[PDB]
Curated annotation (Swiss-Prot):
Binds 2 Mg(2+) ions. Induction: Induced transiently by TGFB1 at an early phase of TGFB1-mediated apoptosis. SMART domains: S_TKc. ATP binds at residues 10-18, 33, 77-79, 82, 125-128, 141. This is Cyclin-dependent kinase 2. Phosphorylation at Thr-14 or Tyr-15 inactivates the enzyme, while phosphorylation at Thr-156 activates it. The keyword tRNA processing does not apply. Phosphorylated at Thr-156 by CDK7 in a CAK complex. Phosphorylation at Thr-156 promotes kinase activity, whereas phosphorylation at Tyr-15 by WEE1 reduces slightly kinase activity. Phosphorylated on Thr-14 and Tyr-15 during S and G2 phases before being dephosphorylated by CDC25A. Nitrosylated after treatment with nitric oxide (DETA-NO). It comes from Homo sapiens. The modification Phosphothreonine is found at residues 14, 156. Transmembrane segments: none annotated. It catalyses: L-seryl-[protein] + ATP = O-phospho-L-seryl-[protein] + ADP + H(+); L-threonyl-[protein] + ATP = O-phospho-L-threonyl-[protein] + ADP + H(+).
Length: 294
């Protein structure tokens, strides 16, 4: 828009392009998402307007909502780096456990807050986890999937990330819960520890099978009702579960137990963000500052 001067493109997703920009008035630097026939549905406007009211230190604040020329622009507070880039930069030495623990603890506080308001992210990935020089980490794009809806692709010709998708979504459940975000965060937690994606599928079935090969093929014993799910197939191969000690070495037992509860198949057995915050793993949590090269 006229009140904003674009500085550089910092993102490309399903909702559209993201640019770092400067507010001609306030002089502030912000992240600007122009959002991707009709002209923006009323339901989307009210939903986003409500999300704008959510304030939490671990959630990227939605500063302004601009509906102009039948177009939609979202103005978010700006952070200089995302977790994806930070991990790539730390791929050689790895992120120190205390920092991993701090980030996980903060992310859970963010989810706990959002979940308490019945708001979910649904498409969590390292790319939408933003960090700053002070040691904070924030979740970006919470509530947008529901506000707008899940499209088929993007305009930059890209697709969402199946790597962090919960099994109930993959199996066709259409009324999934906040538990899907916990699953995604568990996948991200494992990635920070090992420096490699946990379940990097190349298709929906490969995603599901990679999960099955590691956690074992689910059945009625561990997940009641699983065989009645929309996309469940009796013909799925039956794989045995692996020990977490081989999945996320050298994470200690506290971390492994917490990870195990975040990766439970049954959404109703999967730990909530609120309960996770009380896990023994966080007994000695602190807030270290990262070595951030901007």
């Amino acid at each position: 828009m006229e009140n904003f001067q674009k500085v550089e493109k910092i993102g490309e997703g399903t909702y559209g392009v993201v640019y770092k920009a400067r507010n001609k008035l306030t002089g502030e630097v912000v992240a600007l998402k122009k959002i991707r026939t009709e002209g923006v549905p009323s339901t989307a406007i009210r939903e986003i307007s409500l999300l704008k009211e959510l304030n939490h230190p671990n959630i990227v604040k939605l500063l302004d909502v601009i509906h102009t020329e039948n177009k939609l622009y979202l103005v978010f507070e700006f952070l200089h780096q995302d977790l994806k880039k930070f991990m790539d930069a730390s791929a050689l030495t790895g992120i120190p456990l205390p920092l991993i623990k701090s980030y996980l603890f903060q992310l859970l506080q963010g989810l706990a807050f959002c979940h308490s308001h019945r708001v979910l992210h649904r498409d969590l990935k390292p790319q939408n986890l933003l960090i700053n020089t002070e040691g904070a980490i924030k979740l970006a794009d919470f509530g947008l999937a529901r506000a707008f809806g899940v499209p088929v692709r993007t305009y930059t010709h890209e697709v969402v990330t199946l790597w962090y998708r919960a099994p109930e979504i993959l199996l066709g459940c259409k009324y999934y819960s906040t538990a899907v975000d916990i699953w995604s965060l568990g996948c991200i937690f494992a990635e920070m520890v090992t420096r490699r994606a946990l379940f990097p599928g190349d298709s929906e079935i490969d995603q599901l099978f990679r999960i099955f090969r590691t956690l074992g093929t689910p059945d009625e014993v561990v997940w009641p009702g699983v065989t009645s799910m929309p996309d469940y197939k009796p013909s799925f191969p039956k794989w045995a579960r692996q020990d977490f000690s081989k999945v996320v070495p050298p994470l200690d037992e506290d971390g492994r137990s917490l990870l195990s509860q975040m990766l439970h198949y049954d959404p109703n057995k999967r730990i909530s963000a609120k309960a996770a915050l009380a896990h023994p793993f966080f007994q000695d949590v602190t807030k270290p500052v990262p070595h951030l090269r901007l």
